[PDB]
Design a protein around this nucleic acid. Structure first.
Ligand SMILES: [Mg+2]
Ligand SMILES: [Zn+2]
Lengths: 196, 52, 71, 153, 190
RNA sequence: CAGCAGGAUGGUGGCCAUGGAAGUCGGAAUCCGCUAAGGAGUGUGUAACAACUCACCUGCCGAAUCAACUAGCCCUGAAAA
């Protein structure tokens, strides 16, 4: 219940103090349920999983403040949930190579857009429908012989602009997605060192 | 003849309630005690009978 | 099964008049003996199980029952 | 044109109403001949809806068999299947042979979605408890029945 | 028991300057002023800070019956600031099955006639509360939007045309008619 | 301890099963296997799935819950010419 794995971490604490001196300090947004997925084949032996809870995020780390003792500064670092997915081998190409297997989304009202959103020059594959979603927001769509085609390459959300709600039906009717969803790696920590 | 959303809107104010077993009043659906005095804040409650 | 006998007797309370109380004993079963003491005494062979009850062996009676208990 | 299609064929049971018209139909090739030869290529399952893969090519659609491990559990468990009558309290049971633990492995190594012959002693119990059989107790009793007291590679 | 002290504070944004003379507060800003007197509650209203950047309210030596009055004034003040900066807009639909519901506004937003309800020839001369300006919606088939600033004058007058049109002597699991309330919102948006 | 919260099924689409059900239909059963997460689903939906959320679990702050004494006063219980 709420008593059963509560006492087994403070036995299995040390099993990874003395083994694995290398973490990729990933920042936890949208770790999804449908989009962390088509990835396997880059990460076979470079990785681990074990517990972590905010309730002992203090207690067993201060119990660990004693083996290699310059070991305090993480707590103002993780402002949220930031998982330290370990690694073993490479110094730079696992900082690198977690980039090559991700699969993007359906155009959703609800995410954030930090960069430019582009809308392609492509037909919708449908008949006579309502053009008010293209002709009230500022996109040139015209009826093209049953089919509806995006006339000019109209961009929606530029570099650092928030996502509007009622502007997703054009890429959803095209089934084509702005950018690759997945999980973002945030920080670096290597052997008594920090970067930003 | 009727939209099933506006109808979901009109089931809320008329047909999702909880009824006392003592004074036959009509309470909001997440309630545990009657708000009256002539029954004594009794904890006998039922759902309202759905349509047949 | 202790949390269903309070519930059975909470209902049996609606047939009798007056007022009465439900009490969980400190004995073992339908005996007159205590809770923990019972297993150390059965273990040192002072008490004998007889179905619903138990018999007490003193140090007073003659010896042949003692030998018929140890042997 | 290469289109590997998912179909839920009824195996050795020649079906009455299949699921072939909204999936393969609008391509142009007829799925009526194939629904029978696939049950023929099944043969001795006859009970089980092992899903059969079909790959539509430019000439025709091919037939591929996709092996399992929980349907090799139904291979290790050889019970009488039932007819159309379809009556409850159906959930089969039995005794799985300890060398059928070996032989379901020797056909769930072609898929190879697991570990080896000594790493086979969960697959035939923990879903086998939802299909319906036990090897002397479920996975919780076959914890101490299987922990490091084996002689199987 | 007797609890010795309980307080609560409210931050105010800088489009609004507030003050108080005694116990009645006044709040003026982009859409007008509002005044509400709290002279039946017996607490202490203190307004700390240069530029008046937040408020604080206390109650000394109070039981359980009057620790309730710490938050339910902070709410009628956050509502006092919202009804001056933003302003309220209640949207309410109009369900009907077979006959047409006719809705007509008299007095430039300050009166509502209602016709043809369940075939009743009896018009309903519903009056608003002074402060609230009704309107028929746009870009929607059947909809009213009530606008105003004071929420107390808005919501009671909104519920008046909800109780004006009821059903006599029949089922209300089957006879589902009336002008019901859909969405509680503000005039403009932050 | 409430909720302005990031999501829940690649073996299988359980066995024999429903015509079609993949958890969203019936049955002895009800598990442990990267599993901070198994439920052959608490559930909606769909001819079935697809698309969803949730039992159990993962984000943001400065002190609570289950029964039981009717334990004291107060109220309902409580109808006359
Ligand atoms: Mg009548
Ligand atoms: Zn009542």
């Amino acid at each position: 219940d709420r008593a059963t794995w509560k006492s087994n971490y403070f036995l299995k604490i040390i099993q990874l103090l003395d083994d694995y001196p290398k973490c990729f300090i990933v920042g936890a947004d949208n770790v999804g349920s449908k989009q962390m997925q088509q990835i396997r084949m880059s990460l076979r032996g470079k990785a681990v999983v074990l517990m972590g809870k905010n309730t002992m995020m203090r207690k067993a780390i201060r119990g660990h403040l004693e083996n290699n003792p310059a070991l305090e500064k993480l707590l103002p670092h993780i402002r949220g949930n930031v998982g330290f997915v370990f690694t073993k081998e490479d110094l730079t190409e696992i900082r690198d190579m977690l980039l090559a297997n991700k699969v993007p989304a359906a155009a959703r009202a609800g995410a954030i857009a930090p960069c430019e959103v582009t809308v392609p020059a492509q037909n919708t594959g449908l008949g006579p429908e309502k053009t008010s979603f293209f002709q009230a927001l500022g996109i040139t769509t015209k009826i093209s012989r049953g089919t509806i085609e995006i006339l000019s390459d109209v961009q929606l959300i530029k570099t650092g602009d928030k996502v509007g709600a009622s502007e997703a039906t054009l890429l959803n009717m095209l089934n084509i997605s702005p950018f690759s969803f997945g999980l973002i790696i945030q920080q670096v920590f290597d052997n008594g060192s920090i970067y930003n | 003849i009727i939209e099933p959303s506006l109808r979901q809107l009109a089931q809320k104010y008329n047909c999702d309630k909880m009824i006392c077993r003592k004074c036959y009043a009509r309470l909001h659906p997440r309630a545990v005690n009657c708000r009256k005095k002539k029954c004594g804040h009794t904890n006998n409650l039922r759902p309202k009978k759905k349509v047949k | 099964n202790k949390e269903h006998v309070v519930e059975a007797l909470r209902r049996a309370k609606f047939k009798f008049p007056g007022r009465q109380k439900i009490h969980i004993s400190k004995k073992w079963g339908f005996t007159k003996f205590n809770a923990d003491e019972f297993e150390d005494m059965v273990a040192e062979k002072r008490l004998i199980p007889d179905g619903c009850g138990v018999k007490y062996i003193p140090n007073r009676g003659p010896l042949d029952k003692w030998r018929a208990l140890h042997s | 044109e290469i289109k590997v299609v998912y179909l839920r064929c009824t195996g050795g049971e020649v079906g009455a109403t299949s699921a072939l018209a909204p999936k393969i139909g609008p391509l142009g090739l007829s799925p009526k001949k194939v629904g029978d030869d696939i049950a023929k290529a099944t043969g001795d399952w006859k009970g089980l809806r092992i899903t059969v893969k079909l790959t539509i090519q430019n000439r025709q659609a091919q037939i591929e068999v996709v092996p399992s491990a929980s349907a090799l559990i139904i291979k290790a468990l050889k019970e009488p299947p039932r007819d159309r009558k379809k009556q409850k309290n159906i959930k089969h049971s039995g005794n799985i042979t300890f060398d059928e633990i070996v032989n379901i492995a020797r056909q769930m190594r072609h898929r190879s979605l697991a570990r080896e012959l000594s790493g086979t002693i969960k697959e035939i119990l923990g879903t086998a408890q939802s299909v319906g059989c036990n090897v002397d107790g479920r996975h919780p009793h076959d914890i101490i029945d299987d922990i490091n007291s084996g002689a199987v590679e | 028991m007797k609890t010795i002290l309980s307080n609560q504070t409210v931050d105010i944004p800088e489009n609004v300057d507030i003050s108080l003379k005694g116990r009645t507060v006044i709040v003026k800003g982009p859409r007008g002023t509002l005044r509400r007197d709290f002279n039946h509650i017996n607490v202490e209203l203190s307004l700390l800070g240069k530029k008046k950047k937040r408020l604080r309210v206390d109650k000394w030596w109070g039981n359980r019956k009057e620790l309730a009055t710490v938050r339910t004034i902070c709410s009628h003040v956050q509502n006092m600031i919202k009804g001056v900066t933003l302003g309220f807009r209640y949207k309410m639909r109009s369900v009907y099955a077979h006959f047409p519901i006719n809705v007509v506004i008299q007095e430039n937003g300050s009166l509502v006639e209602i016709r043809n309800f369940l075939g009743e020839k009896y018009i309903r001369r519903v009056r608003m509360r002074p402060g609230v300006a009704c309107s028929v919606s746009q870009a929607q088939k059947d909809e009213l939007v009530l606008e105003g600033n004071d929420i107390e004058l808005v919501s009671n007058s909104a519920a008046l045309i909800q109780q004006a049109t009821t059903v006599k002597n029949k089922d209300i699991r089957k006879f589902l008619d009336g002008i019901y309330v859909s969405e509680k919102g503000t005039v403009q948006q932050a």
